Amino acid sequence: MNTVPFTSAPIEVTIGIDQYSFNVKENQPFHGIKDIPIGHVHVIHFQHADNSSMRYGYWFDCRMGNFYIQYDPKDGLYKMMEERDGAKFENIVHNFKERQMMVSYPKIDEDDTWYNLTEFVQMDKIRKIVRKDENQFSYVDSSMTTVQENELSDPAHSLNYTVINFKSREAIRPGHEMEDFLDKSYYLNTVMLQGIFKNSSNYFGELQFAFLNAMFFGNYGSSLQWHAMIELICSSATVPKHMLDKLDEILYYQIKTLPEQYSDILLNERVWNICLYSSFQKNSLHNTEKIMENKYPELL
């Protein structure tokens, strides 16, 4: 079990860790989060009590170092940092535990929610999408644009998702215009899966990360990417049976975890009605369709 200690909490803030969140008051004696489950990527994220504008946060893996949070009063945000002196770090963490100034990441005997949300998400891949290689954790926020968005402006602070474009030469083979555009199997299976991602797990990992960025930060371009990766599968007549089954599982938990009040901005009516009711794979997402119809029948 791992720890992310905080030097302090000088400003009032809502802190979130994976799918859980609490409030910390301006200068309340708070020194971090404890009992964090090793073996999965995590997200600690922040919404300031004064400025709900700019949700931000840090993807990280406790196996890849000892990380702590410290408020920076020049830049005005909680910054994630790495302590290389591990002795100093164990020493500090032990003292805050003894003084009991750390909240406990909920140990929950029945819940696999987070594992199901992050099954294929891996820190090494995250850091290809969010390029900032001197750090081992990755910063994200509400406002960061994607690489495809900057094509339609600062490249350093961008989300370098895989570019998907249904009306592109990449997507459409000469001579198969009608075929490749109505049945995108070629683009999914050979261009993307064999070409760029190499396997279904890298594909799903990017889909999962995109959804979580959208959900946790309201990052519009991540939402666009999530929905695009869904649409390509759902618009391919030939998909490995095992990808379809895992996709149905992935999406099911995404839909289950979504905040009920946010469903109107984060769910694209067209893509979902297409995927669930028109596409080749309309009959293939049984768990996803059951939950969608019982929770958001309005959108359909």
């Binding site: 009306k167 592109s168 030469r169 459409i172 215009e177 009608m178 555009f181």
Partner: protein, 237 residues
């Protein structure tokens, strides 16, 4: 964006552009089979691609053989149209390729755009006008070459005959759409109107009769009256 009554004069500027109309590409007769069920039988069609400034018409004849063994023919028709427009463009010398293509039905945007990915600087646009180009098969000589065709065939026409010698392309386009609107709403009356006076002939190299300036004005009035009329005969007004 879209083409409508407000940006109407753009059609007559010096930027090359083409209208594409795909309404007559897939044509059928519906009939009863011996067993009493209904069957379609397809007949030759055509793609109507027109330069509204020059009057040049690239009439691509869609021979029925291209549907043999295909399914979902209404949808293929739109993809076949785009494939043929793209081939036409690629056949034209660069300085003759269009800078915009205007599709008269929105269902053609996606098929053409996909086929034209190699031409990112050619803008594919829709229009909000209700242009009567589907009545192009009411022009006898266009109907004649489509129905006679025995293979795929491109045939080239000037849909304005020699009008441009005496009027502008704006006026020329207005006459054509009035004529095509009239033929669409009541073909027999439209055709009667055009051919009453036997002394006015259609030249072998032309599609319409060789009216004088004065005779066109009378003609155009008769087509307006017709079009107002049939509108009454239809709505009771």
């Amino acid at each position: 964006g879209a083409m409508n009554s407000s940006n109407y004069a753009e059609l007559f500027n010096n930027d090359i552009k083409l209208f594409v109309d795909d309404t007559n590409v897939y044509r059928v007769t519906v009939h009863k089979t011996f067993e009493g069920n209904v069957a379609t039988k397809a007949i030759n069609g055509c793609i109507f691609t027109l330069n509204p400034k020059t009057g040049h018409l690239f009439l691509k004849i869609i021979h029925t053989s291209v549907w043999a063994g295909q399914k979902r023919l209404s949808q293929l028709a739109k993809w076949k149209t785009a494939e043929e427009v793209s081939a036409l463009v690629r056949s034209l010398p660069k300085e003759e390729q269009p800078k915009q293509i205007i599709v008269t039905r929105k269902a053609m945007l996606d098929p053409l755009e996909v086929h034209m990915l190699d031409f990112p600087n050619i803008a594919i646009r829709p229009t909000e006008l209700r242009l009567p180009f589907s009545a192009a098969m009411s022009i006898d000589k266009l109907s004649d070459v489509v129905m006679k065709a025995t293979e795929p065939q491109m045939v080239l026409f000037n849909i304005y005959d020699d009008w441009l010698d005496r009027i502008s392309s704006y006026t020329a386009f207005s006459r054509l759409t009035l004529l095509l609107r009239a033929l669409k709403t009541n073909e027999e009356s439209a055709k009667m109107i055009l051919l009453s006076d036997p002394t006015i002939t259609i030249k072998s190299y032309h599609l319409w009769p060789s009216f004088t300036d004065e005779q066109w004005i009378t003609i155009e009035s008769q087509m307006r009256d017709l079009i107002l009329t049939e509108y009454g005969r239809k709505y009771n007004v």
